[PDB]
Design an enzyme around this catalytic site. Structure first.
Site, PDB file in Angstrom:
ATOM      1  N   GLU A  59      47.280  71.171  22.996  1.00 48.11           N
ATOM      2  CA  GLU A  59      46.368  70.492  22.042  1.00 48.11           C
ATOM      3  C   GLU A  59      46.189  71.288  20.700  1.00 48.11           C
ATOM      4  O   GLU A  59      46.092  70.693  19.612  1.00 48.11           O
ATOM      5  CB  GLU A  59      45.009  70.196  22.666  1.00 48.11           C
ATOM      6  CG  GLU A  59      44.160  69.230  21.838  1.00 48.11           C
ATOM      7  CD  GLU A  59      42.676  69.204  22.234  1.00 48.11           C
ATOM      8  OE1 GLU A  59      42.099  70.274  22.526  1.00 48.11           O
ATOM      9  OE2 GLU A  59      42.057  68.098  22.254  1.00 48.11           O
ATOM     10  N   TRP A  81      44.298  63.227  25.801  1.00 47.07           N
ATOM     11  CA  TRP A  81      44.094  62.287  24.714  1.00 47.07           C
ATOM     12  C   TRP A  81      44.515  60.840  25.044  1.00 47.07           C
ATOM     13  O   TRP A  81      44.379  59.947  24.225  1.00 47.07           O
ATOM     14  CB  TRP A  81      44.775  62.828  23.472  1.00 47.07           C
ATOM     15  CG  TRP A  81      43.921  63.750  22.742  1.00 47.07           C
ATOM     16  CD1 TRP A  81      43.942  65.115  22.793  1.00 47.07           C
ATOM     17  CD2 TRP A  81      42.890  63.398  21.821  1.00 47.07           C
ATOM     18  NE1 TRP A  81      42.988  65.632  21.944  1.00 47.07           N
ATOM     19  CE2 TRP A  81      42.330  64.590  21.340  1.00 47.07           C
ATOM     20  CE3 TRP A  81      42.382  62.180  21.353  1.00 47.07           C
ATOM     21  CZ2 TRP A  81      41.300  64.598  20.412  1.00 47.07           C
ATOM     22  CZ3 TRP A  81      41.348  62.191  20.447  1.00 47.07           C
ATOM     23  CH2 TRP A  81      40.822  63.387  19.984  1.00 47.07           C
ATOM     24  N   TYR A 145      42.177  65.401  13.679  1.00 50.32           N
ATOM     25  CA  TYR A 145      42.247  66.859  13.329  1.00 50.32           C
ATOM     26  C   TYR A 145      43.530  67.348  12.608  1.00 50.32           C
ATOM     27  O   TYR A 145      43.468  67.873  11.490  1.00 50.32           O
ATOM     28  CB  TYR A 145      41.998  67.721  14.573  1.00 50.32           C
ATOM     29  CG  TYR A 145      40.771  67.313  15.352  1.00 50.32           C
ATOM     30  CD1 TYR A 145      39.485  67.695  14.935  1.00 50.32           C
ATOM     31  CD2 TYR A 145      40.882  66.524  16.462  1.00 50.32           C
ATOM     32  CE1 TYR A 145      38.377  67.314  15.635  1.00 50.32           C
ATOM     33  CE2 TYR A 145      39.775  66.132  17.152  1.00 50.32           C
ATOM     34  CZ  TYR A 145      38.534  66.536  16.730  1.00 50.32           C
ATOM     35  OH  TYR A 145      37.415  66.152  17.454  1.00 50.32           O
ATOM     36  N   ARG A 177      33.442  83.011   0.169  1.00 49.39           N
ATOM     37  CA  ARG A 177      32.496  82.270   0.966  1.00 49.39           C
ATOM     38  C   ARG A 177      32.917  80.806   1.168  1.00 49.39           C
ATOM     39  O   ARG A 177      32.087  79.984   1.544  1.00 49.39           O
ATOM     40  CB  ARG A 177      31.124  82.406   0.329  1.00 49.39           C
ATOM     41  CG  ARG A 177      30.736  83.861   0.278  1.00 49.39           C
ATOM     42  CD  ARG A 177      29.302  84.046  -0.124  1.00 49.39           C
ATOM     43  NE  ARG A 177      29.249  84.153  -1.577  1.00 49.39           N
ATOM     44  CZ  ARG A 177      28.688  85.143  -2.265  1.00 49.39           C
ATOM     45  NH1 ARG A 177      28.060  86.156  -1.668  1.00 49.39           N
ATOM     46  NH2 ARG A 177      28.744  85.089  -3.591  1.00 49.39           N
ATOM     47  N   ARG A 178      34.206  80.519   0.963  1.00 48.05           N
ATOM     48  CA  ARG A 178      34.787  79.170   1.014  1.00 48.05           C
ATOM     49  C   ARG A 178      36.000  79.068   1.955  1.00 48.05           C
ATOM     50  O   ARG A 178      36.846  78.206   1.773  1.00 48.05           O
ATOM     51  CB  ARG A 178      35.246  78.772  -0.385  1.00 48.05           C
ATOM     52  CG  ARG A 178      34.401  79.357  -1.511  1.00 48.05           C
ATOM     53  CD  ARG A 178      34.673  78.594  -2.793  1.00 48.05           C
ATOM     54  NE  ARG A 178      34.208  79.350  -3.954  1.00 48.05           N
ATOM     55  CZ  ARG A 178      34.770  79.313  -5.171  1.00 48.05           C
ATOM     56  NH1 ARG A 178      35.845  78.533  -5.428  1.00 48.05           N
ATOM     57  NH2 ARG A 178      34.261  80.078  -6.143  1.00 48.05           N
ATOM     58  N   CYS A 197      34.855  65.474  16.637  1.00 47.17           N
ATOM     59  CA  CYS A 197      33.712  66.052  17.367  1.00 47.17           C
ATOM     60  C   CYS A 197      33.413  67.492  16.832  1.00 47.17           C
ATOM     61  O   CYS A 197      32.293  67.801  16.403  1.00 47.17           O
ATOM     62  CB  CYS A 197      33.940  65.945  18.899  1.00 47.17           C
ATOM     63  SG  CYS A 197      34.035  64.191  19.521  1.00 47.17           S
ATOM     64  N   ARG A 217      29.554  68.278  15.530  1.00 45.19           N
ATOM     65  CA  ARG A 217      28.542  67.209  15.386  1.00 45.19           C
ATOM     66  C   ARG A 217      28.105  66.561  16.688  1.00 45.19           C
ATOM     67  O   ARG A 217      27.083  65.893  16.715  1.00 45.19           O
ATOM     68  CB  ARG A 217      29.055  66.077  14.506  1.00 45.19           C
ATOM     69  CG  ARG A 217      30.187  65.313  15.146  1.00 45.19           C
ATOM     70  CD  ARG A 217      30.567  64.092  14.359  1.00 45.19           C
ATOM     71  NE  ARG A 217      31.623  63.422  15.101  1.00 45.19           N
ATOM     72  CZ  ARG A 217      31.453  62.549  16.091  1.00 45.19           C
ATOM     73  NH1 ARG A 217      30.250  62.138  16.470  1.00 45.19           N
ATOM     74  NH2 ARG A 217      32.519  62.049  16.696  1.00 45.19           N
ATOM     75  N   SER A 218      28.920  66.713  17.735  1.00 48.53           N
ATOM     76  CA  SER A 218      28.767  65.992  18.978  1.00 48.53           C
ATOM     77  C   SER A 218      29.509  66.801  20.001  1.00 48.53           C
ATOM     78  O   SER A 218      30.722  66.980  19.875  1.00 48.53           O
ATOM     79  CB  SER A 218      29.401  64.604  18.841  1.00 48.53           C
ATOM     80  OG  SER A 218      29.390  63.861  20.063  1.00 48.53           O
ATOM     81  N   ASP A 220      30.140  67.357  23.991  1.00 46.49           N
ATOM     82  CA  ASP A 220      30.238  67.004  25.410  1.00 46.49           C
ATOM     83  C   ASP A 220      30.212  68.281  26.218  1.00 46.49           C
ATOM     84  O   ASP A 220      31.211  68.963  26.342  1.00 46.49           O
ATOM     85  CB  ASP A 220      31.570  66.255  25.699  1.00 46.49           C
ATOM     86  CG  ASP A 220      31.744  65.873  27.182  1.00 46.49           C
ATOM     87  OD1 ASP A 220      31.069  66.424  28.082  1.00 46.49           O
ATOM     88  OD2 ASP A 220      32.579  65.008  27.473  1.00 46.49           O
ATOM     89  N   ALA A 314      34.042  60.315  29.609  1.00 49.16           N
ATOM     90  CA  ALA A 314      33.421  59.171  28.898  1.00 49.16           C
ATOM     91  C   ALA A 314      34.364  58.468  27.854  1.00 49.16           C
ATOM     92  O   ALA A 314      35.023  59.117  27.044  1.00 49.16           O
ATOM     93  CB  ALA A 314      32.103  59.580  28.254  1.00 49.16           C
TER      94      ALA A 314
HETATM   95  C1  LIG Z   1      40.742  65.574  24.237  1.00 49.21           C
HETATM   96  N1  LIG Z   1      39.423  66.139  24.579  1.00 49.21           N
HETATM   97  C2  LIG Z   1      38.626  66.374  23.373  1.00 49.21           C
HETATM   98  C3  LIG Z   1      37.783  65.178  23.441  1.00 49.21           C
HETATM   99  C4  LIG Z   1      38.016  63.944  22.831  1.00 49.21           C
HETATM  100  N2  LIG Z   1      37.105  62.924  23.110  1.00 49.21           N
HETATM  101  C5  LIG Z   1      36.036  63.170  23.985  1.00 49.21           C
HETATM  102  N3  LIG Z   1      35.091  62.217  24.308  1.00 49.21           N
HETATM  103  C6  LIG Z   1      34.069  62.537  25.186  1.00 49.21           C
HETATM  104  N4  LIG Z   1      33.167  61.633  25.496  1.00 49.21           N
HETATM  105  N5  LIG Z   1      33.961  63.789  25.753  1.00 49.21           N
HETATM  106  C7  LIG Z   1      34.883  64.765  25.441  1.00 49.21           C
HETATM  107  N6  LIG Z   1      34.840  65.999  25.965  1.00 49.21           N
HETATM  108  C8  LIG Z   1      35.889  64.430  24.569  1.00 49.21           C
HETATM  109  N7  LIG Z   1      36.769  65.407  24.297  1.00 49.21           N
HETATM  110  C9  LIG Z   1      39.215  66.303  26.006  1.00 49.21           C
HETATM  111  C10 LIG Z   1      39.408  65.149  26.799  1.00 49.21           C
HETATM  112  C11 LIG Z   1      39.334  65.197  28.193  1.00 49.21           C
HETATM  113  C12 LIG Z   1      39.052  66.388  28.850  1.00 49.21           C
HETATM  114  C13 LIG Z   1      39.023  66.374  30.367  1.00 49.21           C
HETATM  115  O1  LIG Z   1      38.828  65.167  31.058  1.00 49.21           O
HETATM  116  N8  LIG Z   1      39.298  67.485  31.058  1.00 49.21           N
HETATM  117  C14 LIG Z   1      39.276  67.583  32.522  1.00 49.21           C
HETATM  118  C15 LIG Z   1      40.647  67.336  33.188  1.00 49.21           C
HETATM  119  C16 LIG Z   1      41.711  68.413  32.970  1.00 49.21           C
HETATM  120  C17 LIG Z   1      42.980  68.080  33.732  1.00 49.21           C
HETATM  121  O2  LIG Z   1      43.849  67.296  33.269  1.00 49.21           O
HETATM  122  O3  LIG Z   1      43.223  68.567  34.849  1.00 49.21           O
HETATM  123  C18 LIG Z   1      38.681  68.911  32.946  1.00 49.21           C
HETATM  124  O4  LIG Z   1      38.524  69.212  34.141  1.00 49.21           O
HETATM  125  O5  LIG Z   1      38.319  69.767  32.106  1.00 49.21           O
HETATM  126  C19 LIG Z   1      38.878  67.548  28.075  1.00 49.21           C
HETATM  127  C20 LIG Z   1      38.977  67.521  26.668  1.00 49.21           C
END
Ligand SMILES: CN(Cc1cnc2nc(N)nc(N)c2n1)c1ccc(C(=O)N[C@@H](CCC(=O)O)C(=O)O)cc1
Lengths: 315, 280
Positions: A59, A81, A145, A177-178, A197, A217-218, A220, A314
């Protein structure tokens, strides 16, 4: 430290109020957070659960080569993804399997549906991997990105290579600083499969050490944040390597830090586990540029975490 | 809490890293800091030293209405940009009298107002970020995308003073509006106090616009730096007993904030210690 991350998850469990969200899952949420990781104390890959670095690598590389198409990711067996591309495909005119309205939620509740999703998902990936026209139309995520870091499109018919510029200001102007890379491009946001995110980041230099702050900004908290911490830590070691510098602090700032309501048992089970040594990152000393690194050039060694804790993504 | 700012200046005095730029300017420095202001405890105009609210009002009203022209600021005794615009009074005067002369030489072009209300695209159109984030707030309060950005990398290397305030994000929980601000560079003695009032007022204004209560203002810093001849002034400030923040009072008879003028924003109970002077 890992404790800092583990404290975020506790704090949301205790105090995070309930908040409806775009995905429909439900979250508990806080606003405004800051974690610090001294990278000299170890590579911040979580040890209280197995976190797949190989996926973090590919990634990152994918982001650094400027690419927004999942084929690359699927070539290295990274499916993190996938869903947003699949979602785009199923809403298109070209798709003709069973109704995938709401697949993100229905795979959990309905077993014969999850089997159907599983079938379609498998033909989707095999089409991306083996049909160049399909890959081209349906692997695409918009100017996410990678497009913004390498190829932020200008008003007069050109592009700014943000990342490469900031790396070079670090070498000649380490006190500026940029030292800023932004992925939030208001023009391209509605085009994006998802807005960034991890939105924007800044570098800083003192006594020959490179430090980085991320604004996110968000956030998870169970699934994503373990990826983002490792992702930005790896990026920082890469840039310190190119720029001839030691490694500093990674500072993680958050907007909406959320725990999905269906990640709670996972986050509690993670809190019941003792913290172990962080691993050490290992990089190829032969590579000179950030942009020359490939999968074999980046390993992590000494990683001896607790077992994998599975959770649902999600949407 | 005002003590969050005060701990910050104290941490810079104690652990700050010295550096010296090309002009010969000394600074004490930290990277990555976060301060929170619960706006239901009072409006965060500093009490440990007097902070001139009028200038913050005029300047926030000028960014908010998308105005990039000094006439507005000049009509309100605000002078903070009549250098990158400038027999002196002849000019100030002419801007204030001659209808056309202000347009010809008082335009400032590209800064917060143009970026918040008028972000140019490739096809020549314009995005009104702030206006859009306000309707998002009313219609989708749970959104994690209430973002306004002042950072275009196409225009930064070209510009005189690139925005110190790089982006801000809004957030709503239980009828209450909060704002977090990412600031890439920060003058800890003269600028930060100025910037805490500004963005808290912005939050109060947007809450009024959208019919919400105020939550927190979160101030996040990148490069936070104390100038070496602000040291004596910072030490003098840390020796003074914190007072209660005052109360902001917004005119409830004006519905929209895009009609607010100086007279409609008042601070009550403001009892600060004396003005501390310093170079800028
Ligand atoms: C691509 N990415 C960045 C990304 C993009 N959109 C998102 N959207 C949401 N709601 N939450 C996120 N964390 C999120 N993350 C992600 C997406 C999925 C996983 C995930 O399901 N990982 C599992 C599975 C890993 C595996 O393949 O074994 C884990 O156990 O950590 C992690 C990062």
């Amino acid at each position: 430290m890992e404790e800092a991350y583990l404290a975020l998850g506790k704090k949301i469990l205790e105090e995070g109020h309930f908040k409806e969200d775009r995905t429909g899952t439900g979250t508990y949420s806080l606003f405004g957070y800051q974690m610090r990781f001294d990278l000299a104390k170890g590579f911040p890959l979580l040890t209280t659960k197995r976190v797949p670095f190989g996926l973090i690598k590919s990634e990152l590389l994918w982001f650094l080569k400027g690419d927004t198409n999942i084929r690359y990711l699927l070539e290295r067996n990274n499916h993190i993804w996938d869903e947003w591309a699949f979602e785009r495909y199923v809403k298109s005119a070209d798709y003709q399997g069973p109704d995938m309205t709401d697949f993100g939620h229905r795979v959990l509740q309905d077993p014969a549906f999850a089997e159907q999703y599983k079938e379609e998902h498998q033909k989707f990936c095999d089409a991306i991997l083996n049909d160049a026209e399909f890959a081209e139309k349906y692997g695409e995520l918009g100017n996410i990105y990678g497009a913004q870091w390498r190829h932020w499109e200008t008003k007069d018919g050109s592009f700014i290579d943000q990342l490469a510029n900031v790396i070079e200001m670090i070498k000649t102007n380490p006190d500026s600083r940029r030292l800023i890379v932004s992925a939030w491009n208001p023009e391209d946001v509605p085009s994006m499969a998802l807005p960034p995110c991890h939105t924007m980041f800044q570098f800083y230099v003192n006594e020959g050490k490179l430090s980085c702050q991320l604004y996110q900004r968000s956030a998870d908290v169970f699934l994503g944040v373990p990826f983002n911490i490792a992702s930005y830590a790896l990026l920082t070691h890469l840039i310190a390597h190119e720029t001839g510098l030691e490694v500093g602090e990674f500072v993680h700032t958050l907007g909406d830090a959320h725990l999905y309501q269906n990640h709670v048992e996972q986050m509690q089970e993670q809190l019941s586990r003792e913290v172990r040594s962080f691993p050490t990152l290992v990089l190829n000393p032969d590579k000179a540029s950030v942009f020359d690194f490939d999968m074999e050039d980046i390993k992590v060694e000494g990683y001896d975490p607790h077992p994998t804790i599975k959770a649902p993504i999600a949407v």
